[PDB]
Amino acid sequence: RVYIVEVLNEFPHDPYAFTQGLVYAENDTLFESTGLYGRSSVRQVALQTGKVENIHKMDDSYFGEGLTLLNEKLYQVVWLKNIGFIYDRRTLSNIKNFTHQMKDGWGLATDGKILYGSDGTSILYEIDPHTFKLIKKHNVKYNGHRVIRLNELEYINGEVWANIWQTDCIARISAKDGTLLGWILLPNLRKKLIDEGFRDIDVLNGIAWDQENKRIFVTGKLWPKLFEIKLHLVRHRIPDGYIERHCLNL
Ligand SMILES: *[C@@H]1O[C@H](CO)[C@@H](O[C@@H]2O[C@H](CO)[C@@H](O[C@@H]3O[C@H](CO)[C@@H](O)[C@H](O)[C@@H]3O)[C@H](O)[C@H]2NC(C)=O)[C@H](O[C@@H]2O[C@@H](C)[C@@H](O)[C@@H](O)[C@@H]2O)[C@H]1NC(C)=O
Numbered sequence: 704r705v706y707i708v709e710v711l712n713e714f715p716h717d718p719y720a721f722t723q724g725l726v727y728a729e730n731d732t733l734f735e736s737t738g739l740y741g742r743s744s745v746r747q748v749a750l751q752t753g754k755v756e757n758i759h760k761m762d763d764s765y766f767g768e769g770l771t772l773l774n775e776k777l778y779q780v781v782w783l784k785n786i787g788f789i790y791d792r793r794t795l796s797n798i799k800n801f802t803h804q805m806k807d808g809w810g811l812a813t814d815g816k817i818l819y820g821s822d823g824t825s826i827l828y829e830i831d832p833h834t835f836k837l838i839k840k841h842n843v844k845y846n847g848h849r850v851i852r853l854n855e856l857e858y859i860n861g862e863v864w865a866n867i868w869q870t871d872c873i874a875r876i877s878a879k880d881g882t883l884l885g886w887i888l889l890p891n892l893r894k895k896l897i898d899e900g901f902r903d904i905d906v907l908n909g910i911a912w913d914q915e916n917k918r919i920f921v922t923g924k925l926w927p928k929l930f931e932i933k934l935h936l937v938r939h940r941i942p943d944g945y946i947e948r949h950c951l952n953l
């Protein structure tokens with residue numbers, strides 16, 4: 704299954720937020736982890752305005768990565784480290800750390816019980832948020848190909864959607880066996896933004912799922928907008944290798 708996305712709503716997103724983690728909490732409150740050394744943060748963000756309502760400015764040495772919210776705690780990984788940070792969502796104080804056993808800290812998501820982690824390999828890791836042991840590694844594959852570059856993750860309805868870094872695709876990955884359930888192609892978002900003059904926006908990255916209202920939000924790094932998107936199943940035939948080219952970059 705391949706989906707395209709329709710933007711239902713655009714919201715401002717801090718165009719300087721190098722989004723590496725995107726969480727929808729509730730009531731139009733997002734949490735975001737931004738990367739870049741010196742700019743990494745965990746943020747509480749108002750969906751409607753993209754206003755940063757609360758920010759934990761990370762140490763300059765960290766490059767904020769995936770973020771998810773689990774049991775009122777934000778779990779964040781960081782780039783080129785196996786350390787994770789846990790923040791109380793209310794104050795964004797780093798209350799606890801963890802380590803994970805991924806190769807890197809890219810994305811995080813949660814099904815509300817466990818953490819899913821990505822490290823940019825094709826492994827979607829299930830991480831126990833108590834022990835921070837790996838529960839399971841899903842080797843995400845599509846058409847025999849590793850779906851590497853699983854980046855920002857979002858658990859949505861039993862699936863973990865993963866931005867695929869440097870694509871405008873999101874992989875829908877079965878939380879059951881890492882099956883690539885579907886590809887979401889979102890080239891329109893970046894393209895339109897670039898058309899609007901946001902020419903140096905970085906990659907699509909950041910998926911947040913609002914289970915309460917059933918809203919998918921996606922944004923990207925340094926994107927000035929965050930998009931509520933609706934997926935539409937592509938019903939037409941997709942060229943062979945299309946996904947491999949666009950989502951797997953070969
Ligand atoms: C999460 O993990 C980070 C990274 O290790 C912790 O921050 C680090 O905490 C170290 C232990 O306190 C800090 O090193 C100490 O610094 C002081 C001042 O120079 C020295 O006196 C002492 O001997 C240690 O060297 C280290 O600086 C700090 N690293 C960074 C990049 O901030 C973090 O600890 C928590 O946050 C930091 C910012 C401090 O407030 C710590 O006291 C606090 O524990 C770990 N978080 C948790 C909740 O464990």
Ligand SMILES: [Zn+2]
Pocket residue numbers: 724725726770811812855856857858909910911912
């Ligand atoms: Zn997310």
